[PDB]
Amino acid sequence: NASQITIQARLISFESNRQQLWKLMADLNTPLINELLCQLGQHPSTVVSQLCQPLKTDPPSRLYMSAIHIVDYIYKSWSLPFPLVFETNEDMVWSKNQKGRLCVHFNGLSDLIFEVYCGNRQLHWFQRFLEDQQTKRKSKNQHSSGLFTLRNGHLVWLEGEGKGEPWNLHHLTLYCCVDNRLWTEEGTEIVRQEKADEITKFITNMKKKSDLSDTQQALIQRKQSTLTRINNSFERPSQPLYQGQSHILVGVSLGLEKPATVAVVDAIANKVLAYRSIKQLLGDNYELLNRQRRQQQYLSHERHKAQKNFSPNQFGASELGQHIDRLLAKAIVALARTYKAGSIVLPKLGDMREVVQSEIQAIAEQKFPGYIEGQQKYAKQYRVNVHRWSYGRLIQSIQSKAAQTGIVIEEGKQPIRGSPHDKAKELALSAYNLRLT
RNA sequence: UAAUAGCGCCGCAAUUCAUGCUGCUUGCAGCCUCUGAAUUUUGUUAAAUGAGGGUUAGUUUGACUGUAUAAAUACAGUCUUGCUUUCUGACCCUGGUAGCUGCUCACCCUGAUGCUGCUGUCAAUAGACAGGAUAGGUGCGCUCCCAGCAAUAAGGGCGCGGACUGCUGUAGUGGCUACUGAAUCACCCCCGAUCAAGGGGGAACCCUAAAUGGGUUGAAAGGAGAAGUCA
DNA sequence: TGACTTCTCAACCTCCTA
């Protein structure tokens, strides 16, 4: 599921409860994590479950295999304490305060009730979590947990500048992973269909093998309960999802001179429904691209000044690049949705170092026809000024936005030369031709 | 006095187009009013970017429902919370105190993606005082260029000693800590809190005759963690 | 440090209390 997103909030409590949480994780959770890593490093992740069992009594029950899960995710990769992750929809118990605010109660923490402070841009997610747990309570465990919209959540701490307290300096922050497709009723229908298919495949797969008489039967009972309870749905909002036209394709061409141009084109016919350039996608936020290019130049020069020896280079850095890469993705997906586009086509990232080099060569030859010295000089100056875009965050951001809205994404091969609009159109047509296979 | 020239950007123009408008013949014809695209040609008495370091639980971008709704949107109602970000404003500063620490210099030459560059007064010393972000140059910036430095790029020349070193003063230039000075804001003012909490008062614009009558008094985007690799 | 890459995204079934 690439549609899942992450919401965040800040948790608030008395100094006493905050002290208990700080002590509990900093003195127990992160030492246990460090110990378990030190153990796995010298080991000659299933065995980790019984590896941690002896460590249980050495120094909060759910937090012990929370640390196991953290360790497993660390291993599979190949004064703030580490984040405490609850990888369960039901680890958190939501409630409404007497003053109306939401509160979280964690399973391992009986008396630790934290009031939730969030932004109105994402309060509806917390209200949805509350309504979901209330619906399960009303149905008396008659709804499958795969549709409570709260996949998992980890609690972290954050740093301050008061410099005068053990924990009052650090702010709590809850990060809940929420499945965006799980909001609307029809998206939940699709999620239920996929999860039922996965359950069928997994039950068929393990039935071909033999397991313990009690644990395997417990798993089977759990899966049958899930399949039974998954058909009973929730009273969620209804949205018609998205239709999508197969023959309409929105191709996006990435380059150096123009970071992103877009062509909405028919495939059954050959007419381009509409082009849009970078200035037309950013709109009123176009000065952001130019000031970001200037900032990128400044930062690159500063890094090359201090590659020998200086302090960290984050001086003057920001997330303007991410903001632009999100504005661009929003605009592109909106443009696709306007024309009922059925798919957004993007260049393969690997063929991105080649494309920018070819574009620089093309620009140099366009400026200086055959003067090789001038072409090299202009290429150097252009690389100095028009720095390489961050074509990785853009592709990922477009993927996230398209998956959220429902527009499928295909990958094509960007043509080497031609005008950016022509490159975009031919990219889209090439993608459609490959899809014909 | 100097910034010639070059590159990127920003607009102003012209031509050509359509991703534009018209017209139905719905893919054609014309046109450039809008919206843009592509060049080249310019930087005004004009336009748009761009403007050193900081300051808000800042405002807006929100959810559901019912519609008119294909949908946009708009309306109505209810609810709304304060997270992480990017702009635009407005405001404050151009720091002090102590310490601790890194770098670089016998002296010359060439001169780096090297450093410095605001105004005014006092001096015309090298520094204070007052202001202050319009801050060396071009409309704006740049590794470009200009003036000075340049030991703190690189390379070369090159004296006295010890056997790679010294010719070195806080001298220049950086970093770290602790305390500390101002703004602690989003129409303005006052009080009040910061693991919470808002309240009061005032001004102006539209509706409204007028009414504590209502509003308005800038907007945007979010998928987060962890690990590894490359540069 | 930037850039890239990988991965992460339960859940009903038990027992226990108030």
Add this chain to the structure above:
DNA sequence: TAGGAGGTTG
């Protein structure tokens, strides 16, 4: 009976 906390497992 309805929460609160533990279990397990490919």
